[PDB]
Structures are given as C-alpha cells and as structure tokens.
Design a protein around this ligand. Structure first.
Ligand SMILES: O=P(O)(O)C(O)(Cn1ccnc1)P(=O)(O)O
Ligand SMILES: O=P(O)(O)C(O)(Cn1ccnc1)P(=O)(O)O
Ligand SMILES: [Zn+2]
Ligand SMILES: [Zn+2]
Ligand SMILES: [Zn+2]
Ligand SMILES: [Zn+2]
Ligand SMILES: [Zn+2]
Ligand SMILES: [Zn+2]
Lengths: 343, 343
C-alpha cells in the first residue's frame, strides 16, 4: 500500500540515476564505450524486480523524517539511497547467479548466460557496486550522515560476502555430506547472506538519514529485522522448489547445487534411516531424475505443510518482536515490511 | 634501495594484518569457517608478489611526513594502508585471472584454477576488497584523512573497473577485428586499468596521510604517475610474450585472448598488407601454432628492438615530467619509483 503509492515515483527516478551515472563522465569521451556498457548492465540487472528493498528506504524515510523536513532535495536523496540498495542487490545477484550456476532471474536469462557476456559479468558486477559510492558522493557528500551511509553499505557488503562464503563452503559440489546441514549452521548462513542487506540495510539507511544514529536504536531495529530476514530466506528456499516459476522469475538450483536449504534441513530432522539414504544418494547432483526423487521425498514428508505452519508461527513471533523492540520508531515501519513478505 | 630497506618490515607486518582481520570477528564464532577461508584467500593471493605498490605507500610516507611525526602509530598505519593497496591489487588480479583465462600468477597456479576453488573465487575476490575498508576503519577512523582515503580507494576501484571494461570490450573472444587496436584506444585502456591504481593510488594515499590534500598537488603528481603507469603496462604487454616465465611468474595470454596489446598495436603500425593478413588469420585464437605465428611476425618486425628503444625514450620523457611537476614534493619520491620500473 504505502509501497505501491511510492513505487512508480521510485521507478521513474531510475532514469535520472542512469543519466547521472552516464553524464558524470561527459568530460571523459575516451571511456564512452565503458559507460555505454555500464548503462546496459544497469538496465538489464537493476530493472525488472519488485524494488521492495529500495522502496523500503523511501517508505521508512517518509515515516521517520518530519514532513516539514521532507523537501524536494531530501526526497531525491532518499530515492537515490533506495536505488543504491537496489544496486548492491544487483551486484550480489549477478555474482550469485554465476556461482550457483543459475539459468534465469526476474523472468529473463541470467546476465552471465547471455551470449557475449559470460565471465565478463564479474567485472560488470563490480561496476554496479562502484556505482553505489558514486551516487552517495554525488547526492549525499554534504550531508551529516554521509560517512554513516558509506560505512553501512561497506559493512553490509562484507557481511553478505561472509554469508556467501558460508553458503558456498557448506555446499561443496560433488561432495555430499548431509551432516553439515544443521539448523544452527543454517541460521548463521542466512543471517549473513540475506538478513543484513535485505532488511537491516534499508531501514538502517533511512534511520541514519533521519538523524537516528544511536547504537541502541539500531540494535533494537536489528533484533526485528534480522529475524524477518531469516524468515524471508527460508521462504526463498521453499519457493526454490515449490514456488511458481512464472511468479518467482527464476529456476531453482538448491538441490543440484547441494545447498544447505531450509528444506533439506527439515527433511534431515524428519527422515527415517531409509529416507536418509535416499536423500544421500540423490542430493547434490545434476540429474533431473535424482532431483525429482528428492522433491518426492520432501512432499512425502509433508514439508510444504511444515512450511505453511512455520510461516504462521514466524509471523506471530515477528509481531511479538515488533511489540517489544519497535519503540521509539513508528510500528508502521516494521508492519509495512512484514505485510510485504507475509502473504 | 629505500624499498629494500623498507621491505622486510613491510612483509613482517602482514601477520598482524591477517591476525586482526581474523580476530576482528572473535566475538562471532558462527563465521569461523568463513574467516578461515578468508585467511586462506589472503595467504594465497596477497603474498608472493614483490609488494612494490604497497611499499611505495610506506616509502613515500617516510619521505613526505616530517620525522618527528613518524611515531610508531603513524608508521603502523602507513604499512596498513600499504597493505590495503596490495589487497586492492589482489582483488583485481583474482578476477582478472578468471576473465583472462590465465593459468599461473606469482609462480603458482591461479587461485580459481585450484581444485576446489573455481568460480567461488569471485566471492573470494570481493572479500579481499572488503578487507581494505575493514582495515581503514580499524586503523584510520580517527584520522583527519580517513574519508579522503576511503574515497581514494573507492574511486581507484571504479577507474580500474572502467579500464577493465575497456580492456574486455576491445577484446571480444572469437571476434577478431584489428581495426579496434589503435594507439589512441590503447592509451585510454591502460590509463584506467593500470595507471590509476598502480601509480597514482599509492602516492596519493601517502600524500593524504601527510596532510597533502591540495587538488593542485594531486594533479601535478598525477601528471607524472599516469605516464609512468602507461609505460609500466606497455612493459607488461611486452613481457607477456617476450618475458622470462620464471621471472614474470605468469603465462601470457594476450594473443589467445585477442587483447589490444601494445605489441599488436605496434605490429599494426608496421605490417605490410601481407603481414596484416597473417596477423588477422592467427590472432585471438587458442591454437599454439597460430600464437607462434604471431610471435614470429612480431620478431620479424623487430618489435623487441622497438620496445627497448621506446623504454629508453619513455624513461627520458618521464624524467622530464619529474623535473616539471615534482615540486613541492621531494623528487626522490618519483625517482625511487622510476628506478623500480626502469631496468
Ligand atoms: O538462494 P540464494 O541465497 O542463492 C538467493 O536467495 C540469492 N541470495 C544471495 C545472497 N542472499 C540471497 P537466490 O534464490 O535469489 O539465488
Ligand atoms: O595484462 P593484464 O592487464 O590482464 C595484467 O597486467 C593485470 N591488470 C589488470 C588490470 N591492470 C593490470 P596481467 O598481465 O598481470 O594479467
Ligand atoms: Zn542463488
Ligand atoms: Zn546463492
Ligand atoms: Zn534461493
Ligand atoms: Zn590478466
Ligand atoms: Zn586483463
Ligand atoms: Zn598482462
């Protein structure tokens, strides 16, 4: 709702983002071809998603900053920082798709799978990251929260990369051991690989723009946001297998990639010794028939019902956390976010 | 000389860099496996080179900062920033080796070619980059030049990535057109992909630590340093084919990769129509025999003599630039650097 009434404004300002990231180098004709490539990278990879993470920055900003302080300049900066969060995302996702050997994202073929792109997409990804800091300097350098934002974005990237490292270490290709796939290990992975950048980052950014820089306030917001992020990633794992491809926009690879998925973790907690063997002999392999066998095992253990039940309980737990930790922040800030990810 | 008498101190402090990048997360046991991987990545990729770029930060710092200001804390920060420059390098080189499909670097197999690593090396690279900003905050946050350094390192990364984009765009695999390989195009590529981070970055960092933040001083230093960087990359292209592998530490790939090399550019300027055809039909292809044919064409046009002559003239041109632009900085600063890269 508040998102949907912020969305189209947010999307419309992507053109100025691309304009300014392209004309920032007008005085340097010799890099024209690189700048054109950057434009193409932006348009293929930063556009086409739902922009929920970036919109969260905008929504939270309007709810945290007093209206008489929300001038045209301040709003412009708010949706610039929103787009920076979308760029960070794009940076990680382009690399993630290479490393997960994925095929599609946002209903199109992954950038690196495009003929002519391939592993050059690695440098494309790094450029998207650099754009974040080009925008922060262009729009926010003179602001009191400038350094806070730079550090928030750098820290969030480090955390996410630690998370990705845990994700990849725990999922060695060609090497199946289910013993690694524990609940404790799972929660650590998704905290770092998803929860920080998808949920803490956007709200924290808006907070700093609102002059809310207190360690206590950020720790309290973080209590709620990291838990939401844990649920969001469990939902991402569920949908990787049971989601509707025309809705998700991407083909799942967790089983083939031998991932420490929430699904496989719950399977391990429930499987008989016989079922364990079936999982062991079919998981982490590229063969369609072996993947289908894993999915059948999941459905036979009613993991879809287990997920639906977990989602209800997670929702309740998170609402409890909001009651406890939202103050002094407007509860609407966390509620709007909760509404976006729960049904 | 001044490098060699700074070197072993510099190298010895890598252990503290690795210590502090590993114990910075003592309070977070759950990421132990990621931190161990980071250590392994650091030790395989930041160690084993000559450290000239990092040593330049240290050397320049000692020459720019008054001795009575060079306390134990300030020196420690100087070789921390030196190591940050080495980490930036490692970040770019790990990715560069994937994208150039290289085999060896620093006398060992490329990180990504190691069994068990592969394209996970992409995330490894990003972690090395993040380490830069972790160190800057840990050691320099309270310093007046803190933000100047953060921005210098981010800007240098952006420039280098623009350069890499130009390098890759100009070298489409399977698509040979020699018409793209001009002198004008070449100079632009190496300015951005090498000159900024290898020569401006280190000196600029030391300058900012010395409180030298003037736009005029940096532009003058940059006049000298970008020209040195252009020569250094031409030398890198020369050695890719005519260098001694046990000295260079890496196998060349420029011809196979269809690169806009200084060699191919000079060849194009000199080749008869018949030789042009020979180049056209053998360049940018993986076949050893076709590569050998290109090398023979280069030697037949005495490109090695052309390089040796160019190196002498470049040296003289750069010394002229130092006479003109070094002041108010100690000329030794640029001379020591020139001495390292010329013979
Ligand atoms: O399941 P992943 O963690 O790989 C994913 O959720 C991406 N991601 C990467 C880091 N955090 C999330 P995606 O399913 O979009 O490919
Ligand atoms: O020749 P490249 O530019 O690929 C190289 O010099 C690396 N590099 C990358 C950007 N600047 C320099 P290397 O020969 O070390 O592989
Ligand atoms: Zn993925
Ligand atoms: Zn992934
Ligand atoms: Zn997923
Ligand atoms: Zn290379
Ligand atoms: Zn290269
Ligand atoms: Zn080279």
């Amino acid at each position: 709702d508040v998102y949907a009434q912020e969305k189209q404004d947010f999307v419309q300002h992507f053109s100025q983002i691309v304009r300014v990231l392209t004309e920032d180098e007008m005085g340097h004709p010799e890099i024209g071809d690189a700048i054109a490539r950057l434009k193409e990278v932006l348009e293929y990879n930063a556009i086409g998603g739902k922009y929920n993470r970036g919109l969260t920055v905008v929504v939270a900003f309007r709810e945290l900053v007093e209206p008489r302080k929300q001038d045209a300049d301040s709003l412009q900066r708010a949706w610039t920082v929103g787009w920076c969060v979308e760029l960070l995302q794009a940076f990680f996702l382009v690399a993630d798709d290479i490393m997960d050997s994925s095929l599609t994202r946002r209903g199109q073929i992954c950038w690196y799978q495009k003929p002519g792109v391939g592993l050059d997409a690695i440098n494309d990804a790094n450029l998207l990251e650099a754009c974040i800091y080009r925008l922060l300097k262009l729009y926010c350098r003179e602001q009191p929260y400038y350094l806070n934002l730079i550090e928030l974005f750098l820290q969030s990237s480090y955390q996410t990369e630690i998370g990705q490292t845990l994700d990849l270490l725990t999922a060695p290709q060609g090497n199946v051991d289910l013993v690694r796939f524990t609940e404790k290990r799972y929660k650590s992975i998704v905290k770092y690989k998803t929860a920080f950048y998808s949920f803490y980052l956007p709200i924290a950014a808006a907070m700093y723009m609102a002059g809310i820089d207190g360690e206590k306030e950020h720790a309290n917001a973080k209590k709620i946001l990291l838990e939401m992020g844990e649920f969001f990633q469990i939902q991402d794992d569920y949908l990787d297998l049971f989601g509707d491809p025309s809705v998700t926009g991407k083909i799942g690879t967790d089983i083939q990639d031998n991932k420490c998925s929430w699904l496989v973790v719950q399977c391990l907690q429930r499987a008989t010794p016989e079922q364990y063997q079936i999982l062991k002999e079919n998981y982490g392999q590229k063969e369609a028939e072996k993947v289908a066998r894993v999915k059948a095992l999941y459905e036979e253990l009613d993991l879809p019902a287990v997920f639906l039940q977990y989602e209800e309980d997670s929702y309740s737990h998170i609402m409890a956390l909001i009651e406890q930790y939202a103050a002094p922040l407007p509860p609407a800030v966390f509620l709007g976010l909760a509404r976006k990810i729960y049904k």
